[PDB]
């Protein structure tokens, strides 16, 4: 488990779950829970366990979004009857799967890219890639794509990222958009 | 008013020679004919030796149907088995009524080890419909049957609503499915999940992923 | 060629009545005294009924005594096998067979017999396609998923049985008394793109055949 390590950053929000109760955006960094201090996500996997253990039924929750710490109230889950807050880590926005012929294989996406901007908006999840393509409206969308692993010490370095024009192409059957991208599994 | 006897587990080597017993429980062996069936996976049994030893052609001349009247024994020998011989064999007799065998699964060693061929299915969209998502991790080409399925989710073991199969052979092979019920709020809570399975130390597996493309 | 085809199985309730039908061709019919043999998993083959080839004696196994009745009709050159009070321990597959003097020489492909308490549940029909990238890979496997039905069986083809060559129907797995498997086949991806494939999916229990064509998954 890779997701471990790095900081409670929202990426996917649940739907008719206990963050989506008391709207949590998509882009949360959270520091603190009740108490708990969260620094990576396996912080928050051992508060939600000693949050259950103790049978805490209220808490309190502190995050950072636009620079700012916000003070929520939510209710805790149960780690014994089969209860989760409902968010999932940053599905890292990397290409997957290249469909052969699709408009991304006509220019020349591989996978193991990661894509930065699309249109000159930073992405950092997957499914804001989606988002940003899904109302696309066919229309030429470029992307800013890293390509391959750096060496140490070198990874913060400002690169020439190579920069694609993509044009969406429509769907024979159903009748949508499809750049033919697959998420990384 | 009999019962006849019959080993269950039985392991010969490829284009070896097996004969297979079939002893009489009370009474004299000769003194009623025994009739030998063959029976593979499923399917319907076939007659392998009747009236004792003799053979309906058609069926291999390898087989061959024997009385050994001092062990009060029934023996179905097998010269040169081959893999299309490898099913279940039924013994069979009578006197006032009609009893069969206990069975005889006649396993053939010999087929070099192959390392299990994952196919990992997502939930179809109509079922999404229903908030229910079952996972698909289809298990096939692999030497011998003994397996060990687990599921993971995001890397975390889980082992709720998890159905695994008993592994079956089919055409020199063996084949398991498994399976994990989740509901459509599940399915979209991880990542990505995977299907480990561990086949004679080899351990390979394939992971599903709910986000799909653009 | 011998054809011996069973009929009248399927779900009935303990204690309540079932007959099996099972009519035979491709013989002199009247010169042949028949049977009938059943199957447990566990126990095994089990002998429970006889038939001269007149008709005029009835022979039982002692595995159940004075419950089932057998009788033909050389008219119509058929077995009839009536089963009064039923228990789930008669539960098994009912094979009918032709005797040759000492023997029996051909066998019915079977019908499974399931005394159960429980109703019939018709099974859920939906199509399984990889979610991965599409790749230029000269081959893909598609599959049917078949979930929740009782009892047993079902059986699924393939374009009507067309595509045979490739395909793998896994076994049942039991699960709050509800079964559930899968049936896979594996074609090309020159035969997907182009033309169509279906499975038919049948139960007899529930006396449902749904076709369910696989579709490529869009987003």
């Known amino acids: 488990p890779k997701y471990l390590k790095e900081p409670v950053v929202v990426g996917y929000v649940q739907r008719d779950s206990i963050a989506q109760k008391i709207g949590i955006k998509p882009g949360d960094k959270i520091i603190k829970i009740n108490g708990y201090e969260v620094r990576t996500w396996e912080d928050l996997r051992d508060a939600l366990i000693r949050l259950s253990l103790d049978g805490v039924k209220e808490t309190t929750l502190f995050l950072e979004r636009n620079g700012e710490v916000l003070h929520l109230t939510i209710k805790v889950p149960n780690v014994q009857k089969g209860e989760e807050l409902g968010i999932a880590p940053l599905v890292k926005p990397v290409v997957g799967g290249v469909k052969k012929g699709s408009p991304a294989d006509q220019v020349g996406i591989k996978p193991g890219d990661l894509i930065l901007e699309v249109n000159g908006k930073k992405i950092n999840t997957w499914y804001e890639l989606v988002e940003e393509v899904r109302k696309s409206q066919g229309k030429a969308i470029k992307l800013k794509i890293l390509r391959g692993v750096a060496m140490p010490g070198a990874e913060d370095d400002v690169v020439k990222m190579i920069e694609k024009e993509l044009i969406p192409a429509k769907d024979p059957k159903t009748g949508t958009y499809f750049i033919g991208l697959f998420p990384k599994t | 008013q009999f019962v006849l006897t019959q080993p269950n587990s039985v392991s010969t080597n490829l284009g070896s020679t097996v004969k297979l017993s079939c002893k009489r429980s009370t009474g004299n062996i000769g003194s009623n004919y025994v009739n030998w069936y063959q029976q593979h996976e499923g399917r319907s049994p076939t007659t392998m030796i009747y009236r004792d030893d003799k053979r309906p052609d058609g069926v291999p001349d390898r087989f061959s149907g024997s009385i050994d009247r001092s062990s009060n024994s029934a023996l179905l020998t097998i010269n040169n088995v081959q893999t299309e011989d490898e099913a279940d064999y039924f013994c069979?007799?009578?006197?006032?009524?009609?009893?069969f065998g206990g069975g005889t699964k006649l396993t053939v060693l010999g087929q070099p080890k192959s390392t299990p061929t994952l196919t990992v299915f997502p939930p179809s969209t109509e079922e999404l419909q229903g908030n229910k998502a079952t996972l698909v991790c289809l298990i096939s080409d692999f030497y011998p049957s003994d397996v060990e399925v687990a599921w993971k989710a995001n890397g975390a073991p889980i082992s709720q609503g998890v159905d695994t199969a008993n592994p079956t052979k089919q055409g020199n092979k063996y084949i398991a499915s498994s399976f994990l019920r989740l509901t459509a709020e599940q399915w979209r809570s991880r990542n990505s999940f995977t299907c480990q399975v561990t086949h004679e130390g080899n351990t390979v597996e394939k992971s599903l992923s709910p986000a799909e493309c653009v | 060629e011998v054809q011996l085809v069973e009929s009248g199985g399927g779900l009935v309730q303990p204690g309540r009545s079932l007959k099996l039908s099972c009519a035979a061709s491709?013989?002199?019919?009247?010169?042949?005294?028949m049977a009938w043999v059943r199957q447990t998993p566990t126990k095994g083959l089990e002998w429970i009924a006889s038939?001269?080839?007149?008709?005029?004696?009835?022979y039982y196994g002692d595995s159940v005594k004075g419950r089932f009745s057998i009788s033909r009709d050389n008219a119509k050159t058929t077995h009839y096998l009536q089963m009064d009070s039923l228990r789930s321990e008669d539960t098994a597959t009912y094979y009918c067979?032709?005797?040759?003097?000492?023997?029996?020489?051909?066998w019915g492909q079977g019908v499974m017999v399931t005394v159960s308490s429980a109703e019939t549940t018709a099974p859920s029909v939906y199509p399984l396609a990889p979610g991965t990238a599409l790749k230029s890979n000269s081959m893909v496997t598609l599959g049917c998923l078949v979930k929740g039905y009782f009892p047993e069986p079902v059986t699924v083809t393939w374009n009507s049985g067309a595509l045979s060559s490739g395909v793998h129907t896994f076994p049942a797995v039991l699960q709050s008394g509800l079964y559930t498997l899968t049936s896979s086949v594996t074609v090309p991806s020159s035969t997907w793109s182009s033309q169509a494939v279906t499975c038919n999916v049948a139960h007899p229990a529930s006396s449902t055949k749904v076709d369910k064509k696989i579709v490529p998954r869009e987003c």
């Open positions: 038939i001269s080839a007149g008709g005029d004696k009835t």
């Open positions: 069979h007799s009578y006197s006032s009524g009609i009893v």
């Open positions: 067979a032709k005797t040759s003097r000492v023997y029996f020489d051909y």
């Open positions: 491709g013989f002199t019919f009247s010169n042949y005294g």
